[PDB]
DNA sequence: TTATGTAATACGTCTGTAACTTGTTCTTATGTCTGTTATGTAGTTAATATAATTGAAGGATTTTAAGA
């Protein structure tokens, strides 16, 4: 169980290093939606329509 | 004129320095042997139990072998 939670919180694609140049970077990073990651799209397999 | 005696001078030279060399003698670093402890290997255990496993996912086109 610890391994699963630390996998998700330490090695996930969506668990990213915080952007901290300025407050706007923080707010924008927290309000970001990614179609990539597990269960999502890959960049060499995502067409124009999406 | 010529013996004589001092004096400059050049050459041996006796001795003081120093180089070359060995004895030997002591000290130390190293290689080796031996004894002890930890490590590494191996064999055995006898209610009974008898077809995995875990994912993973909006691809878009070409070319080229098998099947009919």
UniProtKB/Swiss-Prot annotation:
Transmembrane segments: none annotated. It comes from the Bacteria. The RNAP catalytic core consists of 2 alpha, 1 beta, 1 beta' and 1 omega subunit. When a sigma factor is associated with the core the holoenzyme is formed, which can initiate transcription. Belongs to the RNA polymerase beta chain family. DNA-dependent RNA polymerase catalyzes the transcription of DNA into RNA using the four ribonucleoside triphosphates as substrates. This is DNA-directed RNA polymerase subunit beta. The gene is rpoB.
């Amino acid at each position: 169980i610890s391994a699963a939670v630390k996998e998700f919180f330490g090695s996930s694609q969506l668990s990213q290093f915080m952007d901290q140049n300025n407050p706007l970077s923080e707010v924008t990073h927290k309000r970001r939606i990614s179609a990539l990651g597990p269960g999502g799209l890959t960049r060499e397999r995502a067409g124009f329509e999406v």
